[PDB]
Design a binder for these strands. Structure first.
Lengths: 162, 82, 166, 74, 79, 83, 98, 71, 59
RNA sequence: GGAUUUUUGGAGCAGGGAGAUGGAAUAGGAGCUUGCUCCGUCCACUCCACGCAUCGACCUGGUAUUGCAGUACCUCCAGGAACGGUGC
């Protein structure tokens, strides 16, 4: 059950709780996120929860994409061309993923508009100084794992590994 | 006598419309109503100090249109006869 | 308190904005299921509290069980079931196959037993301190037997659900 | 057509009217009109510095009327 | 209930000096004696004067036919 | 003689709505009187403008001449507004 | 009634432009003056003209920037155009075709 | 004649541009002779502003175009 | 609605639904007249239908 | 069916002054390249008149509320002022 144009044209699309145009693509078990050109950047949020996506890549240019729900998936790697395809990506929910190393968070630093990031329920969050490395690598993010970044955490991230 | 009947008979013609804010929209006129509601298809709009954008459809009101631009090969002498 | 599609979380940080807290609650509730509505106020009566109403009651129950006492913006929010039904949900609404129930309350009618069995999909019939519930599907009957084993309904007594024999 | 505005409840009440260009006046209404023209007897207009100047009975047209707020409980 | 047309007729019969403020123009106003009116609020001022509040000057013009689409507020003065 | 947005605005009288004027003034409150010419008379209204001067007044009246837009709740967008 | 008012009032000044085929100027609210021959008119001053020349003046509008450079005037020509009577501010008839 | 220019875009998401430079993207449900647009669950872009059901008057409308497929 | 002889002279919608409902399987000819009265007590209790007594005696 | 609430528009235009202040990589003219001098276009800082006052959104610290609802917005104190509009 791969993501095609007929699956995106038959999927439900409505208004979310934040008054944004969201398309519900849950319950599809798509192994790879592709063929997203049929939406023509008419959705403000993408609900791709409960899927089997392994890599968050292969997305076309969508300037209206501001929220991406990748919860309950097996995402273990992030694409390096995420900034060239989503310049206005501000919300990224990557809870309960397959990220084990902090080096997968290195392509996530290119998103300058990203402010809300969720990396909870992951083996990469259980490593030593994971939050300090995420604050040092991504200074544009203001809320990490439902927690506001303070000045002391930014000073601790800028002190170590400088 | 009435310019609305002359504007309504100018369908399927590539014209341009300049608004009061400096935005010029060039496209094929497909629908004209009694209130000068210009409905065009495959138009190109250029605003003031902005980039031109191409749209598949556009609907401009009559009160927002400041000036119009017709081609030189338009039969204005034959279309004026009611 | 009976389980419902709306889960109310309280004891949260009231210093954040309303839209940011609503977006954070929606991003927290999207991992457990589709969030239909999010009611969040910042007045003197509803300070520091919000609620999320989902489509399915099982996703709301899983979000209330998993995020019970989770730290939200520095303060551990407490999640619980709603007292009344939501307006959006009211607007949108309007192993073996046989399972043996023991220690059931006699004051409960057939409508309460149907609402308790409605977490599982459509069953064949219901029989009425002992009760017998038979489902049309074997996996649905197994999920209903695994879910109702020690359920929180009429807390003066404890309800026990077991599989029927031949 | 040509229905008059519902100004029967605001009759003989002290209200503040806003006019175009950022003008503010306060006075008691003495009548109504279908063209949204209001007669304010003993009206006082607010200047730019903040001083109130009494202009007496004035007539405000509906073409520049922005918002009228009743200062008395009707 | 006092009608605005009846008040304008009483002001034209009394021949008192009235000041008219323009629409979207607070710097310059007019002042004069309204002689007659019409349905479109067209005022005919005899020996009218344009008063500029910014420059504190007054320029007389005489017989002026002011349209009702520009006059926003009209007040009665003692001068 | 009566329009469908005019009928939707007349049917939404008595609910907590808002009216944003052309100058940016947002009069919010319960729509007590709504005529066919977009005349909105509200009681216990609140002024939240584009200037931001938020205040509370007993009664307000905004005409349809300088009215830019109106924000209404979504309780009447289902029925009988489905055509 | 309407024809006598159109041939005896100010619209006759428009009617002398289409009958004798004379050139008149129209100054709009966008600080532009278009001189041309009026071909079609109406009661709402909807002027459809041919062989028009529109002149105006424009500023660089922070083109390069540092505090010494002047605006300039410009002009253009159109084969056939149509302008509504709302944007028409001034209409001047002068013997310029001869 | 047919007057099907406004009926073909009924129950669809359209983005209307205002005179001051604002853009309202909403589902057009009904209209009138004064071009009164009723945009249910509309977004305001110029930044994103949560508005919802916005009833904009026809005097502040400039242009309108199709945004996407109907929900 | 099934093609019944009683609905021959009928020519409407709401009336057709009312006929298909009222003229449906009424109280007459019920579900075989279920009366099990299982032996779980042997002296009282007989409201168990054909399925209640079966589930009571199976387990 | 161009005379006040919708469609023949009341719209257009310009951002205070000064200083031997600083820059036009590839884009000004003249004294007929390059170096220099003069004059009608910005941004950054400083000074006078942080252009002024207002309220809303917002950041730091301290502090209060533990409350079951369908919402313009919601505790208070102090500092800073990146944003919006109102009148001069």
């Amino acid at each position: 059950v791969k993501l095609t144009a007929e699956l995106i044209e038959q999927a439900a699309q409505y208004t979310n709780a934040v008054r944004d145009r969201e398309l519900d693509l849950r319950g599809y078990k798509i192994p790879v996120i592709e063929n997203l050109g049929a939406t023509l950047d008419q959705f403000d949020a993408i609900d791709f929860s409960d899927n089997e996506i392994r890599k968050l890549d292969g997305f076309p240019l969508l300037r209206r994409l501001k929220t991406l729900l990748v919860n309950n998936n097996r995402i273990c790697r992030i694409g390096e061309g995420l900034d060239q395809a989503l310049p206005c990506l501000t919300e990224l929910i990557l809870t309960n993923n397959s990220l084990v190393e902090l080096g997968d968070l290195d392509p996530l630093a290119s998103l300058k508009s990203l402010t809300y990031l969720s990396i909870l329920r992951n083996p990469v969050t259980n490593k030593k100084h994971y939050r300090l490395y995420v604050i040092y690598k991504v200074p544009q993010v203001r809320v990490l794992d439902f927690q506001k970044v303070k000045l002391k955490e930014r000073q601790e991230a800028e002190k170590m590994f400088k | 006598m009435k310019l609305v009947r002359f504007l309504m008979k100018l369908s399927h013609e590539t014209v341009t419309i300049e608004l009061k804010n400096g935005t010029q929209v060039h496209g094929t006129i497909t629908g004209v109503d009694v209130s000068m509601n210009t409905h065009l298809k495959a138009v190109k709009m250029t605003l003031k100090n902005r980039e031109p954008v191409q749209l598949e459809t556009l609907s401009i009101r009559g009160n927002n249109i400041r000036y119009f631009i017709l081609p030189d090969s338009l039969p204005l002498d034959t279309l004026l006869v009611d | 308190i009976r389980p419902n599609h709306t889960i109310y979380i309280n004891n949260m940080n009231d210093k954040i904005k309303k839209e940011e807290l609503k977006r954070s609650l929606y991003a927290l509730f999207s991992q457990f299921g589709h969030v239909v509505d999010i009611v969040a106020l910042k007045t003197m009566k509803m300070r520091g509290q919000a609620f999320v109403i989902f489509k399915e009651l099982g996703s709301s129950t899983n979000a209330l069980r998993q995020l019970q006492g989770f730290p939200f913006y520095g303060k551990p929010m407490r999640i619980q079931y709603a007292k009344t039904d939501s307006d959006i949900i009211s607007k949108m609404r309007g192993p073996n196959y046989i399972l043996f129930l023991n220690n059931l309350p006699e004051e409960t009618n057939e409508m309460m037993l149907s609402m308790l069995f409605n977490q599982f999909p459509g069953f064949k019939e219901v029989r009425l301190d002992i009760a017998f519930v038979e489902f049309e599907n074997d996996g649905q009957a197994g999920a209903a037997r695994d879910a109702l084993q020690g359920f929180k309904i009429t807390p003066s007594h404890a309800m026990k659900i077991t599989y029927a024999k031949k | 057509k040509a229905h008059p505005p519902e100004l029967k409840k605001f009759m003989d009440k002290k209200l503040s009217l806003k006019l175009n260009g950022g003008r503010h006046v306060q006075g008691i209404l003495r009548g109504f009109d279908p063209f949204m023209n209001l007669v304010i007897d003993e009206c006082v207009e607010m200047a730019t510095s903040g001083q109130q100047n009494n202009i007496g009975m004035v007539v405000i047209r509906g073409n520049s009327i922005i918002m009228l707020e009743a200062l008395e409980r009707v | 209930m006092v009608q605005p047309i009846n008040l304008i007729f009483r002001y034209l019969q009394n021949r008192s000096r009235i000041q008219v403020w323009l629409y979207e123009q607070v710097n310059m106003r007019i002042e004069g004696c309204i002689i007659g009116f019409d349905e479109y609020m067209n005022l005919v001022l005899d020996d009218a004067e344009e008063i500029h509040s910014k420059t504190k000057s007054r320029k007389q013009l005489g017989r002026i036919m002011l349209k009702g689409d520009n006059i926003t507020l009209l007040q009665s003065v003692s001068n | 003689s009566i329009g469908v947005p005019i009928k939707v605005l007349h049917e939404a009288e008595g609910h907590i709505v808002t009216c944003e004027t052309n100058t940016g003034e947002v009069y919010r409150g319960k729509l007590i009187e709504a005529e066919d010419n977009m005349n909105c008379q509200m009681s216990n209204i609140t002024v939240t403008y584009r200037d931001g001067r938020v205040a509370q007044l007993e009664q307000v009246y905004i005409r349809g001449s300088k009215i830019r837009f109106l924000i209404l709740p979504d309780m009447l967008k289902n029925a009988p507004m489905l055509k | 009634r309407e024809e006598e008012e159109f041939n005896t009032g100010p619209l006759s000044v428009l009617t002398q432009s289409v009958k004798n085929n004379t050139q008149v100027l129209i100054n709009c609210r966008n600080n532009k003056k278009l001189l041309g021959r009026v071909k079609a008119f109406d009661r709402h001053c909807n002027m459809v003209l041919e062989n028009v020349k529109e002149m105006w003046t424009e500023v660089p509008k922070s083109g390069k920037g540092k505090k010494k450079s002047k605006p300039v005037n410009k002009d253009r020509y159109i084969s056939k155009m149509f302008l509504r009577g709302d944007s028409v501010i001034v209409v001047l008839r002068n013997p310029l075709i001869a | 004649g047919k007057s099907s220019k406004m009926l073909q875009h009924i129950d669809y998401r359209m983005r209307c541009i205002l005179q001051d430079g604002r853009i309202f993207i909403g589902t057009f449900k009904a209209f009138d002779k004064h071009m009164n647009l009723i945009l249910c669950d509309c977004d305001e872009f110029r930044e994103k502003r949560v508005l919802g059901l916005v009833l904009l008057r026809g005097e502040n409308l400039v242009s309108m175009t199709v945004e996407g497929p109907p929900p | 609605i099934p093609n019944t002889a009683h609905f021959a002279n009928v020519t409407q919608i709401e009336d057709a639904v009312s006929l298909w409902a009222k003229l449906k399987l009424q109280k007459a000819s019920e579900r075989w007249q279920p009366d099990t009265e299982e032996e779980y007590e042997d002296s009282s209790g007989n409201v168990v239908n054909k399925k209640t007594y079966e589930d009571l005696k199976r387990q």
